[PDB]
Homo-oligomer: 90 residues x 3
């Protein structure tokens, strides 16, 4: 499992979410933040190893505008993930 | 240390916070977020730094308190932390 | 690469941003959160999220520690998280070392 944290332009959020959905990426969490200050959207997406590239690519393509300020995408290691509904791991 | 990131239902937050307090967990950060399991749902994200010996007990407290058994309960991520510092003292841990 | 997560007092934000820019740090993300320390109900804090290369880890941490300190309970904490890789959306450039 990996945890993807992406910072994108609010104006590109809808396009980004559509792209993720298209790529079969459904689980995600997002919040509004400020960055350098300008408003931005932060997405945190927990994915299995096979979905790292597809997720990263969906965002790269949908979030780019070509102008400085487009954002970044971090891929973080995750040691364990638990599903609250079942109380079981993964 | 590890960093616990839990996404829970808003209606379960008080129960979660009570469970953490009872499990001796005092240090934590939280905020409101939106999530999908276009339909976004309000959720609450908790970020808790906890040392290895106590990761399991802390995760368990959240699991029990946040559960409803219905789809949408959320997930808990446990991330590795290379280093942690206390600002009040600068202490490397 | 590393991802620095710092929780600081709102009152210390401007001083922290100042020290960071001075340390040649510029790109970063921040948000308002509610928190509580290890003592004994929640208080507002500012959460900084800073992606940096290995050479900038020590300098970034040093800047926050020096500027965000009041010496009183509630000062916050700094987490240095491992990053597998980072992509710049505009250029598609990837960093890993
Ligand atoms: N190093 C970083 N750490 C954390 N967040 C960052 C970092 N760099 C950029 N960001 C986030 O992404 C936003 C835009 O980044 P920016 O570097 O301007 O993109 P671009 O590569 O197009 O110039 C920043 O305002 C912030 O929200
Ligand atoms: N893989 C994930 N990555 C990031 N956040 C997630 C992920 N899965 C779920 N979430 C967060 O947990 C909330 C509830 O998700 P979940 O319990 O899986 O409901 P569902 O069963 O419909 O997927 C989501 O709204 C989101 O905030
Ligand atoms: N273990 C933790 N996990 C996540 N956030 C924490 C943790 N401990 C403290 N915080 C954040 O820092 C704030 C408390 O500051 P802290 O440094 O613990 O006080 P003190 O300077 O007395 O050590 C909390 O309100 C929260 O925002």
């Amino acid at each position: 499992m990996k945890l993807i944290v992406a910072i994108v332009r609010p104006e590109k959020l809808n396009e980004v979410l559509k792209a993720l959905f298209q790529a079969e990426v459904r689980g995600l969490t997002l919040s509004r933040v400020q960055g350098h200050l300008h408003e931005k959207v932060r997405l945190e997406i927990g994915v299995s190893e096979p979905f790292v590239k597809p997720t990263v690519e969906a965002i790269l393509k949908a979030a780019r505008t070509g102008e400085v300020g487009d954002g970044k995408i971090f891929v973080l290691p995750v040691e364990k993930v638990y599903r609250i509904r079942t109380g079981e791991e993964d």
